[PDB]
């Protein structure tokens, strides 16, 4: 059934499992027309498909041409997501295919279940966790590859950089969700924290800065403060 705080360490066991987040698949800007009506313009999007054990991210870029001439795009986007996830699974060797796929939004359950009928042994699960994967487009290198795409494309990343050399996947996921939660709550401040010190750089082959263990503790503390702050600035506390 659903994934929650009770069964949380199941994410970090050796069974292959993927989270799928569809919140950046169909993206639009809303604007006025010359006649003073409202219209939307789609921009490139992405499926965020992640292994929480290894950190491997399968970023399927959704080019705006896939929407041309189609109706009911928000509904189509869920089906397109499930089509692409199914295609990804079929492309993987049997021993790399997931035993579970956890969708971050319950509206993905039926589309994914229908597209995965050929895989009856892969469990399709919701979650009660409120995960901040929508903020993936606040990671500069991910946003850059999505916006630059001129055609459909899959790009593979490790969202943990080299962290697993020094920390466990439980701790790496906790750091990732803290960073993304911060970027979601106050992107400007979060990004200031991450780059304020120009002597700490992002390696060409990485997504985040090359912090030492001690610097990550400072960074992590700064992100918690930011989240608590904004939570006050929000509710006034």
């Amino acid at each position: 059934g659903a994934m929650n705080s009770s069964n949380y360490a199941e994410l970090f066991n050796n069974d292959i499992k993927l989270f799928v987040d569809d919140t950046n698949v169909y993206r639009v800007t809303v604007h006025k027309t010359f006649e003073g009506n409202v219209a939307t313009k789609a921009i490139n999007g992405c499926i965020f498909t992640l292994n929480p054990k290894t950190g491997h991210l399968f970023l399927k870029i959704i080019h705006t041409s896939v929407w041309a001439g189609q109706k009911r795009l928000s509904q189509l986007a869920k089906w397109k997501t499930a089509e692409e996830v199914s295609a990804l699974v079929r492309s993987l060797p049997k021993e790399e295919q997931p035993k579970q796929i956890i969708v971050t939004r319950k509206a993905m359950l039926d589309p994914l279940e229908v597209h995965m009928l050929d895989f009856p042994n892969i469990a399709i699960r919701p979650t009660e966790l409120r995960l901040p994967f929508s903020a993936a487009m606040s990671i500069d290198k991910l946003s850059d590859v999505v916006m630059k795409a001129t055609e459909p494309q899959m790009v593979l990343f490790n969202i943990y950089d080299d962290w697993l050399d020094r920390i466990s996947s439980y701790t790496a996921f906790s750091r990732l969700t803290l960073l993304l939660r911060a970027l979601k709550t106050n992107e400007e401040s979060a990004k200031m924290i991450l780059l304020s010190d120009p002597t700490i750089t992002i390696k060409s082959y990485h997504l985040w800065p090359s912090f030492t263990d001690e610097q990550w503790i400072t960074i992590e503390s700064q992100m918690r403060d930011l989240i608590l702050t904004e939570y006050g600035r929000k509710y006034n506390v």
């Binding site: 089509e83 039926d110 589309p111 279940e113 229908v114 597209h115």
Partner: protein
């Protein structure tokens, strides 16, 4: 007009015959039911006074043989049997009629209810859903499970309704996943109508039989089947116009006949709200929507 005699009535029981019912007291001199209309299937059903658990009954068609009821004190129920000696049977019935020990099937002349509930129901199809080939009649009870229920446990005692499953490879063409799931016309028209049922008459007959088993026996898997067969039509954008018109009539008479007090358990809120108000056919069931809104507005 045909007759189903009873050897005796040794235990107190409520006896149904189609939509009618009457109480028989323990050892009351009751010897059966006469004046049963020829041309229709019928159901004779039982609920014991001491154990309302297990409503049970027998589907039959008097054109196919001479049938009677006899209580079995070992198995503890009223059993239908066939009498092969036609002269013995005629002689039995005539004696019981002369002594006026039979109830008359109490059909009002104006009244087409039973026809309207059984229009497409055929004994030959009932006998494929309920498999017991040595008898010409079919036993059903409250507890019998369906083939689909068993997939999710005695096979000989199952209701072999046609399995409908909207999230199945049968229902969903590879490469048409979204199309087939949101518009079930393929599954309805090619898979089920052309492929399995052959025609809409057989589809409606199974739908009507499922409803009647749900209503008369409280058979839960039958209720599931009835709703699934409605939903499959309503969730199809492309349905022959004669089928939609006939479905509206079928459902109208089913809703009309349902006991007002059993609507809570026999009607699935989700299916009916979807069918009447959201589905492709939301505007095609005028008679059914009107009776539902006036009789069960709470459900909606």
């Amino acid at each position: 007009m045909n007759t189903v005699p009873f050897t005796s009535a040794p235990i107190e029981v409520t006896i149904g015959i189609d939509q009618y019912s009457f109480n028989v007291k323990e050892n009351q001199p009751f010897h059966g039911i006469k004046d049963i209309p020829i041309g229709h299937v019928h159901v004779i059903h039982f609920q014991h006074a001491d154990n309302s658990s297990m409503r049970y009954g027998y589907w039959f068609d008097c054109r196919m043989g001479n049938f009677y009821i006899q209580y079995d004190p070992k198995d503890g129920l009223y059993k239908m049997m066939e009498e092969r000696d036609g002269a013995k049977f005629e002689n039995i019935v005539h004696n019981f009629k002369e002594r006026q020990m039979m109830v008359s099937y109490p059909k009002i002349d104006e009244d087409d209810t039973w026809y309207n509930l059984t229009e497409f129901v055929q004994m030959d199809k009932i006998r494929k859903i309920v498999r017991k080939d040595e008898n010409q009649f079919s036993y059903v009870d409250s507890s019998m499970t369906t083939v689909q229920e068993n997939e999710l446990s005695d096979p000989a005692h199952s209701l072999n309704y046609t399995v409908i499953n909207f999230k199945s490879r049968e229902a969903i063409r590879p490469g048409h996943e979204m199309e087939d799931f949101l518009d079930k016309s393929y599954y309805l028209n090619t898979v089920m109508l052309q492929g399995i049922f052959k025609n809409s008459s057989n589809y409606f007959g199974e739908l009507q039989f499922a409803f009647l088993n749900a209503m008369f026996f409280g058979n839960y898997g039958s209720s599931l089947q009835w709703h699934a067969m409605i939903e499959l039509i309503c969730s199809s954008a492309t349905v022959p116009k004669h089928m939609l018109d006939k479905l509206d009539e079928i459902l109208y008479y089913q809703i009309k006949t349902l006991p007002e007090q059993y609507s809570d358990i026999l009607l699935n809120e989700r299916v009916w709200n979807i069918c009447l108000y959201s589905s492709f056919q939301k505007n095609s069931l005028h008679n059914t929507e009107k009776i539902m809104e006036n009789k069960y507005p709470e459900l909606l």
